[PDB]
Design a binder for this molecule. Structure first.
Ligand SMILES: [Mg+2]
Ligand SMILES: [Mg+2]
Ligand SMILES: [Mg+2]
Ligand SMILES: [Mg+2]
Ligand SMILES: [Mg+2]
Ligand SMILES: [Mg+2]
Ligand SMILES: [Mg+2]
Ligand SMILES: [Mg+2]
Ligand SMILES: [Mg+2]
Ligand SMILES: [Mg+2]
Ligand SMILES: [Mg+2]
Ligand SMILES: [Mg+2]
Ligand SMILES: [Mg+2]
Ligand SMILES: [Mg+2]
Ligand SMILES: [Mg+2]
Ligand SMILES: [Mg+2]
Ligand SMILES: [Mg+2]
Ligand SMILES: [Mg+2]
Ligand SMILES: [Mg+2]
Ligand SMILES: [Mg+2]
Ligand SMILES: [Mg+2]
Ligand SMILES: [Mg+2]
Ligand SMILES: [Mg+2]
Ligand SMILES: [Mg+2]
Ligand SMILES: [Mg+2]
Ligand SMILES: [Mg+2]
Ligand SMILES: [Mg+2]
Ligand SMILES: [Mg+2]
Ligand SMILES: [Mg+2]
Ligand SMILES: [Mg+2]
Ligand SMILES: [Mg+2]
Lengths: 159, 168, 176
RNA sequence: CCGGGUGUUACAGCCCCGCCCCGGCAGCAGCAGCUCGCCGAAUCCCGGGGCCGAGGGAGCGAGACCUGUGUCGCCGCGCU
RNA sequence: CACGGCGCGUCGCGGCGCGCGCGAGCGAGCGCACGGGGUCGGCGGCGAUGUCGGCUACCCACCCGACCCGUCUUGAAACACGGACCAAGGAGU
RNA sequence: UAGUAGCUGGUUCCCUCCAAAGUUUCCCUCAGGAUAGCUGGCGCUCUCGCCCGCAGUUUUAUCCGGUAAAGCGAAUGAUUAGAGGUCUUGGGGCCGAAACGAUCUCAACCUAUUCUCAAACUUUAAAUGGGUAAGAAGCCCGGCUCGCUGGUGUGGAGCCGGGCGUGGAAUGCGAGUGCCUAGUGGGCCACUUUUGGUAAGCAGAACUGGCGCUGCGGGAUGAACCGAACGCCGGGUUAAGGCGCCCGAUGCCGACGCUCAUCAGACCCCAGAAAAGGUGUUGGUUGAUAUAGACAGCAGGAUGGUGGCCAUGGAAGUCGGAAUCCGCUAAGGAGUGUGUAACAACUCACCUGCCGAAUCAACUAGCCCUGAAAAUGGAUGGCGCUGGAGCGUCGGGCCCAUACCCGGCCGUCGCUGGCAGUCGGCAGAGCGAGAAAGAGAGUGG
RNA sequence: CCGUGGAGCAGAAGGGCAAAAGCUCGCUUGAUCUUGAUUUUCAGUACGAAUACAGACCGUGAAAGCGGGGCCUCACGAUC
RNA sequence: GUCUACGGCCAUACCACCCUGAACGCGCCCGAUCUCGUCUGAUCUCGGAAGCUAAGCAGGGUCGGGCCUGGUUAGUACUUGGAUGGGAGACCGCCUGGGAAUACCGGGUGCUGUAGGCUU
């Protein structure tokens, strides 16, 4: 059977990208994580302290505790037929703010603003994101040039 | 050239049985409310509906229904879902109560709203119980393969009307 | 394709959707022989995807209509340039037929391909169909019908409707 | 009569091409009941064959000045 | 033409729309029916020692179907095991 | 002493409803247990007749990866071949006392190239896929507490109070929660992916669906294939598959072709065949030559230097080694073959006479044939079939499943549906009707 | 002088590392005392291993800081 | 236009060679009493201001290497789902969707934050 080591099969997952080894850029250290941010997990092999287990690599969780160097986050893990929301502590290098939430936040601010506006105007405005509707009817103008014929080319071997 | 607008309404008929269905296809068929062979329903078209139908192409025959097809389907096979019960629509008051708040008050409102995909098409279609169509008189071409390659599955633009004429 | 019944000829023109790169993509036109317009559009998308970097999701059928025969009362000779797949390798050929309609000639071509080379419609790729003058015809099976005083009998007429008089006291005659 | 050759309207015809009101006239997806289509808010009428008939007190009008009846509700009509 | 009274008519844009009163939101009868699931206010024969009815059940014929049960087993008609037949007794207290 | 048995065998009435597992971890554990998982029963808390949630699904955003592919003129590791440079060294020689002084070279070396590779290589890098978000538990304000952090009522957190409902993607659907609990813990098969193995109806995995637990139509037969899942019936129509007879349906004046087998062929799984060949036949590709008269076929020529040089005992063209010339010519090869030891002789290439319009190849692909040998007599299911009842492409019509549609009947579940209003000379017969609520009781003008 | 690691970091291999995690010196004993939480196998139980903290005593450095064993992935043991 | 101090993103910023640098600045540079450290005041530390853009550094150049970004390769390779498709097989074709990577050919060669100067 296999081995139950903590880092089995991570030679590519925890490795560094090509031509990106060396000193960790300081912007990663200079970011602020508060209680309740949605955050992504991406193990970085450069630092070995507080490295998350390989099964949380690429997972997104919620911050619930902030500490000197690390952050505690609640993340869902599918174990057999059930999902457990378990909390793990990850050092700040292996973490990154999720941009999936800021889009929704900006949308909230923007449609709240356009709801506050036009409230006095009384006009109607659409807020829900409708799915891509079918294309409407239109005209395709030929400019006096007729469409050119397309025919299959004859078979002839290359190799 | 004048390209007509892409159709907004489609009719879908399940043409495969219950035995041996992939879980994803089973879930999409449940969502589309095709739990029985030769069941049919109306679907409004968008990106989500296109992809959902593409997932279950081998199990359904779908097309763009005609006005006469909508009329006949509503009048002959049309039953309403009132109080979680399948009630045949034999009077306008049954429609008027279930869809009065949406200004649908009779068969004509129901048919118009379905055919033109109105603002409350979702409510109208959900009130409409899935259609139980008889087996296609005259037979099918080939159930297993796609319509383009001479079968019956997949998308047939307007031949769904020919299919409906014999399946109802 | 399933070569069901007699084929029909369709003129199909299509184009890419307008994009910020280019406002008006060029329109591409093709002749498709197909049982109906649905399979005609499918074949158009297939061929244009092979030729150009076009897909149905990133394109649109600007127009699709059946083209009727110009002279359906004049018997004509048709030359067809064709590309097909064998069990081992693919081949280009040229075959001539004799018929009143281009669609009829192409249907004859499909049936002849199936009969002589066991090639199927999904293997045949039809390339060119042209009216060919009797002087330019070069297959003897078509050339032998090019004469003013054509004359031949019907030598051995086989009795059909063999079952309507299922028990008949004659032995049937085959010389008429 | 046939065969071979020449050739360009002749004692047959064929194809294309500017116009003559797209020349004019029917007609028209034609019961010249098969030359090739897709259909019906742009669709109605009549007829034939087969199987079945489950359910069983729906009410009407009469007005506390009457007490009848069992063809009644919705719908479409007709007559006064 | 699912049009139909008189008015005060601005309830009004120029009349149509569209409001306020008119014992004040009460006209009645008959009749036909593509109308909340069939009725006939339609008929015809054969009936006393040779005839009527009797699904099933007794015997027989025909067409179609049809391998012997129980058990262990992935798999039993098995060239796997128990079983000639019948009566009584016989095992989650 | 009815000793123990994780092991065999057996384990007694009906109907109704629900309905599995052969998988995880531990065990002197591997024919067994415990524990999760899968099941049933009992409930309970709410819900609708504005809104909550949920989803084996999609959409819009946003991250995650190192497989398929590809690459070696990129790293690592393999790997073929020639080019150009030098003394940076070695090896055969050479002139040199010697001299990087010099001549070739063979090499190793360097620089550009070049052929082919990787499960334990990789700059790149999919498709399918794995998370997260898509609002009321949200946004926007005002104010308090803090022993934490603090240049700073700084930061952060917790508290109160107040204002905002277009309930902020599609589709579908009532949801949550708690006890007790049986059986199971031998599995097998199939498309796709995949490891060992020459391979196997072998052994081992991943995903999904099946069989087991399951009947029905078709595949003649059949645990798994194709269709379709089932209460008892009538009518209609189909799926897959079929329609010469067995055997329901083509007893159509069905369409176009191909094929002759002295071993024909005849329908997923599937039950039998390859390389190589055919001047059998049918298509197709490419290249030639033919009225300056071909292809046949019938006839005439097919010469000198020279019996060319090296050769062998003998080679005159015909065993051997290079070349292959000229004048004569309508043409003749220092020769295509047969022949002798050598000749000789015959014959061919090539050109002429007659004949007078099409003729040669080389490939390629269909059907058929050779390749093709096993034992009881023998199996497209059989009979049989060749203007097919075979093969390929196709058209109408027709046949039938327990599937689908309509109807009847039985039962189960749901509506936690309705009925105490049988309110009668003491009475007045309703609460089906699109619109939350009185056929309300009475007092004045 | 060139030298992106082609060396070294105890060991297998893989990942990681250049004014360092390598080499050489200086000083030391965070390999110390203590309660909880979490991850890894998982039944989501132990052991083992590991991760963030918190409370004392310290080490080092000018200091920010770093350190409660070894750069990470393995080197170990219930009841009585 | 540009520099210095501290930086963010970390080659469009690197590497090789060549040309030009006004002012400030950054440097090279001059010494070892003190602080400090070496075999050596070379480095480090300290005290200065005679000279110089030689070098670093900055800007620019190269049919430059590299790097970054496009086209081609290419709807090719591969691939989700489907068939009672073909083939003895190996494998291949089609339907429904997604869709690469070399060679080869183009374009570009650091943006920018805070504080403080020079261009009087
Ligand atoms: Mg199936
Ligand atoms: Mg029929
Ligand atoms: Mg299938
Ligand atoms: Mg029988
Ligand atoms: Mg047994
Ligand atoms: Mg079993
Ligand atoms: Mg025995
Ligand atoms: Mg036994
Ligand atoms: Mg016995
Ligand atoms: Mg007994
Ligand atoms: Mg006992
Ligand atoms: Mg045992
Ligand atoms: Mg046993
Ligand atoms: Mg891997
Ligand atoms: Mg590969
Ligand atoms: Mg196996
Ligand atoms: Mg089951
Ligand atoms: Mg089954
Ligand atoms: Mg069989
Ligand atoms: Mg039936
Ligand atoms: Mg049969
Ligand atoms: Mg029914
Ligand atoms: Mg250091
Ligand atoms: Mg501490
Ligand atoms: Mg160390
Ligand atoms: Mg000095
Ligand atoms: Mg300088
Ligand atoms: Mg200079
Ligand atoms: Mg360059
Ligand atoms: Mg700056
Ligand atoms: Mg000046």
């Amino acid at each position: 059977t296999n081995t139950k080591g903590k880092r089995r099969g991570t030679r590519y997952m925890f490795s560094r990208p090509f031509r990106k080894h060396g000193v960790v850029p300081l912007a990663t250290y200079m970011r602020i994580y508060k209680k309740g941010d949605i955050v992504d997990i991406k193990g970085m092999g450069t630092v070995q302290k507080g490295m998350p287990h390989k099964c949380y690599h690429g997972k997104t969780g919620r911050v619930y505790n902030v500490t000197q160097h690390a952050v505690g986050i609640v993340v869902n893990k599918q174990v057999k037929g059930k999902i457990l929301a378990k909390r793990i502590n990850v050092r700040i290098e292996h973490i990154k703010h999720s941009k999936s939430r800021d889009s929704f936040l900006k949308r909230v601010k923007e449609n709240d603003q356009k709801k506050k506006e036009a409230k006095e105007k009384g006009t109607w405005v659409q807020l829900k994101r409708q799915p891509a509707p079918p294309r409407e009817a239109h005209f395709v103008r030929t400019n006096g040039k007729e469409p050119e014929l397309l025919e299959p080319i004859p078979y002839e071997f290359m190799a | 050239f004048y390209v007509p607008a892409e159709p907004k309404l489609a009719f879908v008929i399940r043409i495969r049985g219950i035995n041996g269905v992939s879980p994803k296809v089973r879930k999409v068929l449940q969502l589309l409310r095709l739990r029985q062979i030769f069941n049919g329903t109306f679907v409004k078209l968008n990106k989500a509906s296109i992809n959902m139908l593409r997932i279950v192409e081998p199990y359904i025959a779908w097309g763009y229904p005609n006005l006469k097809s909508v009329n006949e389907l509503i009048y002959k096979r049309g039953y309403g879902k009132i109080n979680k019960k399948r009630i045949a629509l034999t009077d306008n008051t049954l429609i008027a109560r279930s869809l009065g708040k949406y200004n649908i008050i009779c068969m004509e409102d129901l048919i118009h709203e379905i055919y033109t995909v109105g603002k409350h098409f979702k409510e109208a279609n959900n009130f409409l119980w899935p259609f139980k169509l008889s087996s296609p008189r005259g037979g099918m071409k080939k159930k297993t393969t796609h319509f383009v390659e001479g079968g019956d599955a997949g998308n047939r633009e307007d031949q769904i009307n020919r299919l409906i004429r014999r399946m109802n | 394709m399933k070569a069901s019944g007699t084929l029909r000829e369709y003129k199909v023109v299509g184009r890419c959707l307008p994009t910020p790169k280019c406002r008006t993509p060029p329109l591409y036109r093709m002749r498709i022989f197909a049982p109906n317009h649905v399979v005609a559009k499918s074949r158009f998308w297939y061929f244009v995807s092979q030729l150009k970097k076009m897909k149905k999701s990133s394109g649109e059928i600007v127009y699709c209509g059946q083209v009727f025969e110009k002279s359906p009362l004049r018997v004509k000779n048709f030359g067809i340039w064709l590309r097909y797949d064998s069990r081992s390798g693919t081949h280009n050929m040229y075959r001539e037929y004799r018929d009143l309609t281009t669609a009829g000639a192409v249907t004859q071509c499909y049936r002849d391909m199936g009969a002589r080379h066991r090639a199927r419609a999904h293997s045949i790729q039809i390339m060119k169909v042209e009216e060919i003058a009797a002087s330019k015809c070069r297959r003897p099976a078509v050339k032998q019908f090019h004469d003013s005083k054509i004359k031949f009998p019907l030598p051995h007429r086989v009795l059909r409707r063999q079952h309507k008089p299922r028990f008949t006291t004659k032995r049937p005659n085959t010389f008429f």
